[PDB]
Amino acid sequence: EVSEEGFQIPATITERYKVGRTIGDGNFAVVKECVERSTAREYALKIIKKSKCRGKEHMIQNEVSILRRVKHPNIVLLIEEMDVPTELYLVMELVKGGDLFDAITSTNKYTERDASGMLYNLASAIKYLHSLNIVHRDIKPENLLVYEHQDGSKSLKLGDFGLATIVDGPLYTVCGTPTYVAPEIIAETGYGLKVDIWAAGVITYILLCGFPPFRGSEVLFDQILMGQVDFPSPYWDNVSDSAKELITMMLLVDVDQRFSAVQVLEHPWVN
Numbered sequence: 001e002v003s004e005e006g007f008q009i010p011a012t013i014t015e016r017y018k019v020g021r022t023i024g025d026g027n028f029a030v031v032k033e034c035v036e037r038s039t040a041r042e043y044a045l046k047i048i049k050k051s052k053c054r055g056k057e058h059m060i061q062n063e064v065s066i067l068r069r070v071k072h073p074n075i076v077l078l079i080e081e082m083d084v085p086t087e088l089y090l091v092m093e094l095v096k097g098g099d100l101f102d103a104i105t106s107t108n109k110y111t112e113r114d115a116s117g118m119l120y121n122l123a124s125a126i127k128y129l130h131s132l133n134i135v136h137r138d139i140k141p142e143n144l145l146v147y148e149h150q151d152g153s154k155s156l157k158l159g160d161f162g163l164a165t166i167v168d169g170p171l172y173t174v175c176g177t178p179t180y181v182a183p184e185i186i187a188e189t190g191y192g193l194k195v196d197i198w199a200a201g202v203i204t205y206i207l208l209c210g211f212p213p214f215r216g217s218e219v220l221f222d223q224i225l226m227g228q229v230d231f232p233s234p235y236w237d238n239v240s241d242s243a244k245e246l247i248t249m250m251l252l253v254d255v256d257q258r259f260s261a262v263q264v265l266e267h268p269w270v271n
């Protein structure tokens with residue numbers, strides 16, 4: 001069985017799953033809808049194209065090592081994995097509401113009730129990862145999935161563990177998306193778990209006004225290193241002081257003063 005992209009879907013996958021349409025894509029993966037034949041239950045099939053070397057070998061990947069460990073309602077669950085020489089197949093929980101990048105483009109901005117609930121979901125996921133010493137390093141809207149409840153309410157689920165790792169002393173790899181990257185990453189002075197809180201702070205800021213706190217014009221990186229968070233008029237005039245205070249504590253350049261996920265969850269705006 002060959003997909004439209006040319007993927008040679010393993011026999012064991014096609015035996016138990018009916019592979020459907022592409023529901024999402026990224027730089028490294030193609031994600032499809034699929035249906036477990038025995039139950040008619042829907043799942044997502046994530047297909048990761050592995051990095052090729054000279055010769056017949058392919059480079060090894062880290063994502064499954066982290067995904068196997070993580071089980072939380074605000075994290076996309078891994079169901080099964082199938083490694084073949086050229087690609088890796090991941091059967092995951094299907095999140096029918098799509099991603100937060102498309103949601104933000106469609107809706108523009110959110111109410112404080114909606115944004116606070118979304119931050120509670122994200123900070124809940126981060127608290128759980130940080131309890132396991134796992135830093136995600138790629139928290140941003142395209143990696144957040146919108147779960148739609150039977151009553152119409154929504155919850156966020158964190159996905160894409162492609163850059164995730166274990167923090168056992170400071171990390172130095174410069175990685176991430178400029179809009180969401182913590183100043184200590186760009187500064188190359190050593191970073192840890194709280195780069196995820198900075199990313200969450202940037203997302204919360206975007207949810208309430210529709211644009212990021214550091215937009216640049218070099219100026220972008222200088223803005224991030226200085227960390228001056230502005231709440232410009234009229235866009236932020238009707239937003240509460242409580243929301244602004246929490247976003248400020250999440251976007252502190254001083255990592256020791258910056259909130260932990262626990263401190264975010266304890267803040268009155270998310271309670």
Ligand SMILES: Nc1ncnc2c1ncn2[C@@H]1O[C@H](COP(=O)(O)OP(N)(=O)O)[C@@H](O)[C@H]1O
Nearest residue numbers: 024025026027028029031044094095099142160
């Ligand atoms: N489990 C899932 N359920 C529904 N859609 C999913 C999904 N996992 C991923 N997606 C969609 O596929 C896109 C890319 O998947 P992701 O895991 O982020 O791959 P990547 N590393 O290439 O960026 C996501 O932005 C989202 O639109």
Ligand SMILES: [Mg+2]
Nearest residue numbers: 026142143160
């Ligand atoms: Mg992604």
